[PDB]
Amino acid sequence: ADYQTIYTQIQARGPHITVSGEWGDNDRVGKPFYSYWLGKIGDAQIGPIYLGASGIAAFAFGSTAILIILFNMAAEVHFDPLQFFRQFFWLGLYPPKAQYGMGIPPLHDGGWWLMAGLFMTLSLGSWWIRVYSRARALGLGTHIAWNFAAAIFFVLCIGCIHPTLVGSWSEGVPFGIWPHIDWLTAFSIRYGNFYYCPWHGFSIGFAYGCGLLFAAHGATILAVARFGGDREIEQITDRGTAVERAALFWRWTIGFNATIESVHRWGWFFSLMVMVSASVGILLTGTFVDNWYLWCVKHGAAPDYPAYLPATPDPASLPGAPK
Amino acid sequence: MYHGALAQHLDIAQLVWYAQWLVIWTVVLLYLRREDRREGYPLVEELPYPKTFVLPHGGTVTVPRRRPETRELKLAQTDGFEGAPLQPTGNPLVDAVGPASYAERAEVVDATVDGKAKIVPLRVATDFSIAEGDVDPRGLPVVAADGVEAGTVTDLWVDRSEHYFRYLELSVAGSARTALIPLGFCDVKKDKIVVTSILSEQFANVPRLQSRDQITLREEDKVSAYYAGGLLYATPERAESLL
Amino acid sequence: ALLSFERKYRVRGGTLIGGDLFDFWVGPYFVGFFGVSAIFFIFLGVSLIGYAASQGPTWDPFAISINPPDLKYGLGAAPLLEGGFWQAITVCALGAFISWMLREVEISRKLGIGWHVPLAFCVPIFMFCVLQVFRPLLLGSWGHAFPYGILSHLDWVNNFGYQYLNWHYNPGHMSSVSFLFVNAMALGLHGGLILSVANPGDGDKVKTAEHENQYFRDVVGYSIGALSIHRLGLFLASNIFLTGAFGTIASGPFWTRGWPEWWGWWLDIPFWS
Amino acid sequence: CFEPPPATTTQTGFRGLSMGEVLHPATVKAKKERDAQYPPALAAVKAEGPPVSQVYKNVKVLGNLTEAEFLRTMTAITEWVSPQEGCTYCHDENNLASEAKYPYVVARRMLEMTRAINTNWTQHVAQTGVTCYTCHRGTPLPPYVRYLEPTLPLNNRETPTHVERVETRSGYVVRLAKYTAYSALNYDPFTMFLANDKRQVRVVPQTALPLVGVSRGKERRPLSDAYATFALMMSISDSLGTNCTFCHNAQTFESWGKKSTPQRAIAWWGIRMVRDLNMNYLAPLNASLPASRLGRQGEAPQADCRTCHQGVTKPLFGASRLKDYPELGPIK
Ligand code: BCL
Ligand code: BCL
Ligand code: BCL
Ligand SMILES: C/C=C1/c2cc3[nH]c4c(c3C)C(=O)[C@H](C(=O)OC)c4c3nc(cc4[nH]c(cc(n2)[C@@H]1C)c(C(C)=O)c4C)[C@@H](C)[C@@H]3CCC(=O)OC/C=C(\C)CCC[C@H](C)CCC[C@H](C)CCCC(C)C
Ligand SMILES: CC(C)=CCC/C(C)=C/CC/C(C)=C/CC/C(C)=C/CC/C(C)=C/CC/C(C)=C/CC/C(C)=C/CC1=C(C)C(=O)c2ccccc2C1=O
Ligand code: HEC
Ligand code: HEC
Ligand code: HEC
Ligand SMILES: CC(C)=CCC/C(C)=C/C=C\C(C)=C\C=C\C(C)=C\C=C/C=C(C)/C=C/C=C(\C)CC/C=C(\C)CCCC(C)C
């Protein structure tokens, strides 16, 4: 067995390396320290971290959003500390309950929610600049930034684009552990069962697909760690037996295979598509589909089942029934 | 009237469904599956135009490689059937066939970002050490699959780019040499390093390095492959059925 | 037929059972004893699906469904058309899965690599068994298992959740979902990183292992490492089902109320009630 | 934290839909024992004699009974409502025709309410019906009532904690939660849906595409309505000690026919019945009950599903006294 694939038997220590970026070298902060136990299942060095204007801006905008949320939560328990701590999961910051359309809602009924959302959006945008600019500073491709962009875009879809397209801030996601959860069901119910949204299915296949691919890829690299398969950049530019055996394991199993470079394209694509699929689904929801189940019924796709208990007429349709 | 309704019994969500499928299959079949063919092709016994990488330390490479030389395989076919397995004609560990196979990697030293040799023994990497609390294997006996002492650990080889030990170096008992072994083939105990991949005698033919204090990408391949070959070839029983 | 680097690896050996008998290739695919048994179970399973499906009211892929028995049949045999086909197909599914896994072990051995992938493949097989075998046994009827149909199996998942009022509050579910999310996120990060290093853009130099660790130290103040991200990835993915399994098997056998109410253990502690 | 096996499970939909009840035997046992306390019917009495409209001075509703029959009903009522206090809960001991005590006037109206339920709402109560006991369970104040704000504990025979008290504002979210099966849904489904007939429980479209004129901006219902409906349904579920699949195939909540069970239609009639009881019999009693019975907005206690059902899909597991007391309905 390869014990190294479980944990690092013998850890190494060294002078810490700093690779210069085109700018911002002076804005790296912190004294690096070494954790023995972390060192068994990752690199032992924690820190330093890069600051920079966009990272700072992210913390300022994001902390503001979080402060607005937490303060409104505390009010919901009338500023009792014990109850705040107890009831925390049930507390939340809600979008407008009344229909004011796209008018900016009153503070007590949606206005604080909208404000926290504005600051969260600024925080996300700021962090994206960081993720993008750091790559450019280090002469790296912007693969991570563009994947991140899609995730941000999905958040904007459920947060303000769908609300804007159907014209009501009431459709947005609340802030809160259970309350943002409650929205999932409310939204699915309203639009006719999200199991019947095809983009929900696409998103799920890709989400499950990322599970499959990282289990398979992670396991594969561990399995060829004996040949240094983890050194994947130089395995790309100079194929080693690690990735020859990896390719052949899969070729012999499923009849075809990837390369050490291309498997990362598959993973990146699958990841991306969870968010691209979700976004399109949300954008079609409410705008051009009001009931996904009935949309499937329209197109003849929905499964049907025999009666078990006897069919039940809608009593609201019966003669002389009350309203 | 309905939002999203079009001519016929047709609607917009319906149209986007076909577009979605088209995009996915185009990406998969016309791009991703072509990126999959940058190594191992053309087959022997649909392809993208070549990709060229500018290397970090001078020079370029274009993949897949065309090597100016190719190796002669000491293998015999077991039958005339197209899909029949091959069979080693000699010692498969030294001949490097099957799981003892290595790749024709560059005979260049893997480098650090600042251009120094990446994989080096601690006698060269004097600014590196083993973390407090972990076993220092130097001076410990190496015990092979047959329970015989094959040698004594003389050094560790560290990756200076990732701060990660990748090989032990041991004096081979009765053969006036040292051999490297990847740490994946070592079970590190307090008083010994256990190696079940090969028998004690088989340490004698581990591929040798050209220089004592550095190692090339091909040499790393050769060394790693040798022990892997042992998993199937160390003894006659290992090539046979488990049950 | 062979990849350019394939021939040297095409040796005999690494089998669990059979010996040389099944130790050969059919095109790119390795066979082995478990390749034979895999094809056997697959052929048998697909045949049963076809025979059962012809007896139904539709050939539409979305609408076809092969369902388990009524609850009242318990853990016994059921008539072929009233749940028996389901029972047989289930057996074939399990045989194919386990065969596939063991075949991968034989291929690992031949290649001189670790058995990480087949071990990983035991996870989704394990979860299937939790859904179709272990939970139904505990509840006392095969009829609690999910049906085999493209859209119908979604209706099962859906009703099952709502039987416990709000399944989102299921604590094993919360863990399962968290792992689904973090894994997909980590795959995007990792895939993106490796491509960003090998494809710097323009005509720039490919970067380094040092650059990898610098990027993530800069962005989040920590980089886990090249090998370690492959251990982490496998751990995160696996735990989608390893943790999920607890929430699935708890629902019914160990809990019959709605899931939100479960959290009363915390909410209803006397001292803050 | 958890409940031990084995579990009682039923099937309420086609095999392989996972529709059906999931019950804990110990819980069902406790409830069966509690409901078994229902006093048995009083023995039959003499059918011949003058009607009490002749014999007695101030009989308005039960005037056609014979004296024996009438006094039997008085005894039954006492058992069901005020067994510990006896006749004098409602009566001036020295003048039985006097309406001087508030319980008397309320009780007359409750006789009318009960007869109305068993006559006019058989689409819900069927031949099972209700007696005073169904709600009261042997006390003047029924154990499961609602005010125009959430209250805890759900059972008013239980002593409240400080935080459970309606005056303690920090406990509001929990009072809301425990009425919607512990969900964090921020809606009171009682006042929203059961106190009156103002709101529409249905929230899902019956068209595949969005209908023009109802689908944009201020034409739209707010999504809040979908949360509020879900809150009522969590409350309904808990009050009947069941789950959604007792009434719906979750495939399509909004569909009837093979997608709903017979129980769902009965429940529909139940919502209409509750609204009649509240609007026309219970709410107006605030004029007749003392200040000490009223809520903080001057409201009389009112009824929801739990009032009768008390955690079971059928009240008292379907126990009936209908044949034993024809004077409680159905009325010819
Ligand atoms: C408890 C949770 C549920 C469940 C809840 C859901 C939900 C929710 C959704 C799905 C969806 C899917 N599920 Mg499911 N699903 C469950 C168990 C299964 C099992 C099984 C053997 O147990 C299988 C084969 C499937 C298969 C499927 C696919 C039809 C679909 C996409 C998955 C995907 O891309 O994954 C990753 C794998 C890949 C990317 C590789 C490609 C795999 C291909 C697509 C599998 C095709 C199998 C097909 C049905 C043929 C069966 C074999 C025949 C005999 C030939 N599910 C369990 C019971 N499933 C999605 C959908 O769109 O439904 C129609 C979806 O939204
Ligand atoms: C009863 C409820 C419904 C339901 C309601 C919904 C609704 C509504 C939606 C989904 C969506 C999805 N559902 Mg669903 N879903 C149900 C059942 C399922 C089942 C199942 C087995 O039954 C599965 C596998 C899924 C799976 C999924 C996901 C794959 C999919 C995408 C969401 C996602 O990845 O977000 C996880 C990722 C994110 C949220 C991205 C976050 C990224 C950002 C950048 C991170 C920022 C962090 C930052 C630090 C935070 C700062 C905040 C501070 C305040 C400042 N659903 C049932 C039927 N589901 C989504 C979808 O695809 O719709 C088409 C969606 O909108
Ligand atoms: C109202 C409905 C419910 C709901 C009801 C359920 C129920 C019930 C269950 C889950 C479970 C899960 N839910 Mg859910 N879930 C809901 C909302 C969500 C949301 C969301 C965004 O709101 C998300 C992200 C999820 C996500 C998830 C998953 C993480 C989790 C595990 C799925 C699984 O077991 O697959 C299983 C997949 C398999 C078993 C696949 C097996 C594959 C085999 C080994 C290979 C097959 C080979 C194939 C046939 C080959 C074909 C040949 C071709 C050539 C390829 N759910 C809502 C609230 N969910 C499960 C869980 O773990 O609960 C804790 C579960 O039991
Ligand atoms: C956490 C663990 C994750 C994970 C991990 C891994 N996943 C692996 C490996 C690892 C490590 C591999 O080693 C192996 C592989 O080779 O990689 C390509 C594999 C594989 N993952 C597949 C599907 C897959 N993974 C899913 C989930 C996860 N994967 C989770 C997320 C899901 C979901 C989510 O639904 C699906 C659909 C196949 C492509 C492949 C098996 C092929 C097979 O075993 O051949 C043998 C079996 C057949 C060829 C078919 C048998 C026909 C039966 C008898 C008749 C059908 C009956 C059936 C029940 C009807 C259902 C229909 C209805 C639901 C509509
Ligand atoms: C004809 C006959 C009866 C023959 C008998 C012999 C026999 C047993 C034949 C098998 C026949 C059967 C049943 C074939 C079906 C095989 C299957 C299950 C095919 C499904 C293909 C699917 C859906 C795969 C899903 C995963 C997916 C999206 C993969 C694409 C990306 C790839 C190829 C990832 C694999 C891959 C990974 C994960 C690496 O880490 C890695 C590292 C270094 C080099 C290469 C690789 C590599 O190729
Ligand atoms: C309420 C909770 C009551 C209890 C307990 C008892 N009685 Fe009653 N009684 C009640 C009402 C509302 C009425 C009027 C109903 C009507 O039909 O109009 C009555 C009426 C009587 C009468 C008729 C007297 C008359 O008007 O002449 C009698 C004789 C009577 N009640 C007797 C009685 C006895 C003996 C009781 C206990 C042993 C008893 N009542 C309890 C309300 C309630
Ligand atoms: C629910 C479905 C009920 C049925 C059936 C009957 N009663 Fe009732 N009653 C009910 C409520 C919710 C209330 C208000 C709470 C309260 O106790 O005030 C009542 C009230 C009365 C009272 C007044 C009690 C008091 O506060 O002193 C009486 C005397 C009374 N109810 C009697 C009564 C009788 C005799 C019934 C049937 C013959 C009857 N009630 C039916 C709820 C319900
Ligand atoms: C009866 C025994 C029911 C149980 C248990 C649950 N529901 Fe229900 N639901 C029921 C009825 C009679 C109605 C219609 C009310 C009316 O005025 O006609 C409903 C309604 C819903 C809806 C809305 C349907 C619509 O068209 O908009 C939903 C979305 C719904 N119910 C969901 C639901 C859930 C999730 C349940 C358990 C958790 C649940 N219901 C229980 C009857 C009954
Ligand atoms: C101490 C540690 C380190 C940090 C603490 C974290 C903490 C306690 C946070 C607060 C409590 C918690 C956990 C809350 C959780 C909330 C969750 C999970 C919320 C989830 C989702 C919320 C979403 C998607 C909200 C989205 C909102 C938007 C997209 C808004 C967009 C708004 C605009 C575009 C405004 C423009 C219009 C203009 C006219 C005003």
Tally of domains in chain A: 2
Last residue of a domain, one of A109, A125, A143: A143
**Closest ligand 3 atom to C172 CA:** 64
> Any CB–CB contact under 8 A between C116 and chain A?
yes
Give distance in angstroms: CA of C244 to centre of ligand 3: 9
The verdict on residue A61 lying in a domain is yes
Element (H, E) at C30: strand C29-30
- CA–CA min distance A84, chain C (Å): 11
**Closest ligand 2 atom to A69 CA:** 54
Residues C90 and C117 both lie in one domain: yes
Residues A24 and A81 both lie in one domain: yes
Give distance in angstroms: CA of D142 to centre of ligand 7: 7
Identify whether the C-beta of residue D284 lies closer than 8 Å to the C-beta of residue D299. Answer: no
Where do we find the tokens 């945008």? A125
Residue A232 among known ligand-binding residues? yes
Residues A282 and A208 both lie in one domain: yes
Residue closest to A173 by CA, chosen among A197, A192, A147, A154: A154
- Looking up residue A223, the CATH number of its domain turns out to be 1.20.85.10
Residue closest to A77 by CA, chosen among A69, A66, A86: A86
Residues C158 and C179 both lie in one domain: no
All chains having 3 or more CB pairs closer than 8 angstroms to chain D = A, B, C
Residues A53 and A196 both lie in one domain: no
Residues C202 and C252 both lie in one domain: yes
- The range of the structural domain enclosing residue C180 comes to 166-273
Find the residue in B nearest to A19 (Cα).
Answer: B113
Last residue of a domain, one of C148, C165, C182: C165
Residues C129 and C60 both lie in one domain: yes
**Closest ligand 8 atom to D206 CA:** 26
Residues A75 and A177 both lie in one domain: no
Residues A101 and A162 both lie in one domain: no
**Pairwise CA distance, residues A81 & A75, whole Å:** 11
**Pairwise CA distance, residues B65 & D38, whole Å:** 90
Domains and CATH numbers, chain B: 2-104 (4.10.540.10), 105-243 (3.90.50.10)
Residues C158 and C176 both lie in one domain: no
Q: In A, which residues are within 8 Å of D268 by CB distance?
A: 315-316
**Pairwise CA distance, residues B2 & D138, whole Å:** 57
Residues A158 and A125 both lie in one domain: no
Give distance in angstroms: CA of C242 to centre of ligand 3: 12
Residues A107 and A230 both lie in one domain: no
Q: In B, which residues are within 8 Å of D213 by CB distance?
A: 1
Residues C154 and C232 both lie in one domain: no
- May I ask the CATH class of domain D143-205+221-313? mainly alpha
Residue closest to B193 by CA, chosen among B142, B134, B130, B153: B142
Is D222 close to A96, i.e. CB distance below 8 A? Answer: yes
Identify whether the C-beta of residue A242 lies closer than 8 Å to the C-beta of residue C227. Answer: no
Apex CA A183: angle with CA A179 and CA A189, to 5°? Answer: 145
Is A237 close to B225, i.e. CB distance below 8 A? Answer: no
Tally of domains in chain C: 2
- The range of the structural domain enclosing residue A114 comes to 1-143
Residue closest to C258 by CA, chosen among C194, C186, C170, C196: C170
Identify whether the C-beta of residue B239 lies closer than 8 Å to the C-beta of residue C13. Answer: yes
The verdict on residue A314 lying in a domain is no
Identify whether the C-beta of residue A275 lies closer than 8 Å to the C-beta of residue A151. Answer: yes
Bridging pattern class, strands B193-194 and B141-143: parallel
Last residue of a domain, one of C165, C188, C216: C165
Characterize B110-123 residue by residue with b for buried, 16 or more Cβ atoms within 10 angstroms of its Cβ, and e for exposed: bbbbeeebbbbbbe
Residue closest to C8 by CA, chosen among D14, B92, A84: B92
Residues C119 and C179 both lie in one domain: no
- Looking up residue C15, the CATH number of its domain turns out to be 1.20.85.10
The verdict on residue A260 lying in a domain is yes
One-letter identity of residue C65: S
Resolution in A: 3.5
- Chain centroid, CA D233 distance in Å: 15
Is D210 close to B11, i.e. CB distance below 8 A? Answer: no
Q: In D, which residues are within 8 Å of A100 by CB distance?
A: 218
Is D251 close to C159, i.e. CB distance below 8 A? Answer: yes
Long-range contacts formed by B53-57: CB under 8 A, 24+ apart = B53/A236, B53/A237, B53/C198, B53/C206, B54/C203, B54/C204, B54/C205, B54/C206, B55/A237, B55/C205, B55/C206, B56/B111, B56/B113, B56/C205, B56/C206, B56/C207, B56/C208, B57/B111, B57/B115
Residues A128 and A201 both lie in one domain: no
Residue B149 pairs in a beta bridge with: B143
Residues A94 and A133 both lie in one domain: yes
**Closest ligand 6 atom to D62 CA:** 17
**Pairwise CA distance, residues B26 & D287, whole Å:** 75
φ/ψ bin of A193: left (φ > 0), alpha (ψ from -120 to 50), beta (otherwise): left
Residues A110 and A234 both lie in one domain: no
Is the torsion defined by CA of B156, B157, B160, B161 positive or negative? negative
Residue C168 among known ligand-binding residues? no
Residues C200 and C135 both lie in one domain: no
**Pairwise CA distance, residues D103 & D106, whole Å:** 5
Residue closest to C35 by CA, chosen among C105, C129, C115: C105
Residues A189 and A286 both lie in one domain: yes
User: D318 in helix, strand or coil?
Assistant: helix
Where do we find the tokens 């106190």? D195
Is C254 close to D24, i.e. CB distance below 8 A? Answer: no
Residues C230 and C243 both lie in one domain: yes
**Pairwise CA distance, residues C259 & C251, whole Å:** 9
Write out B138-199 in H/E/C secondary structure: CCCEEECCCCCEEEEEEEEEEECCCCEEEEEEEEECCCCEEEEEEHHHCEECCCCEECCCCC
All chains having 3 or more CB pairs closer than 8 angstroms to chain A = B, C, D
CA distances from C76 to B106, C49, C69, C72 (A): 64, 21, 10, 9
- Chain centroid, CA C142 distance in Å: 20
> Any CB–CB contact under 8 A between D212 and chain B?
yes
Give distance in angstroms: CA of A155 to centre of ligand 2: 9
Where do we find the tokens 């004129």? D213
Give distance in angstroms: CA of D263 to centre of ligand 7: 27
Residue closest to D17 by CA, chosen among D185, D261, D232: D261
**Pairwise CA distance, residues C223 & A21, whole Å:** 17
Among A234, A236, A269, the residue with its CB nearest the CB of B32 is A269
Among D14, D224, D262, the residue with its CB nearest the CB of A306 is D14
The verdict on residue A298 lying in a domain is yes
Residues A201 and A294 both lie in one domain: yes
Residue closest to A117 by CA, chosen among A76, A155, A84: A155
**Pairwise CA distance, residues D198 & C80, whole Å:** 52
> Any CB–CB contact under 8 A between D245 and chain C?
yes
Q: In D, which residues are within 8 Å of C131 by CB distance?
A: none
Identify whether the C-beta of residue C248 lies closer than 8 Å to the C-beta of residue C131. Answer: yes
Superfamily of domain D24-142+314-332: Photosynthetic Reaction Center, subunit C, domain 2 (1.10.468.10)
Q: In A, which residues are within 8 Å of D216 by CB distance?
A: 166-167
Is the bond preceding D153 in cis, omega lying within 30 degrees of 0? yes
**Pairwise CA distance, residues C68 & D141, whole Å:** 49
Last residue of a domain, one of C165, C188, C219: C165
Is the bond preceding B42 in cis, omega lying within 30 degrees of 0? yes
- Provide the H-helix boundaries in D181-243: 189, 224-239
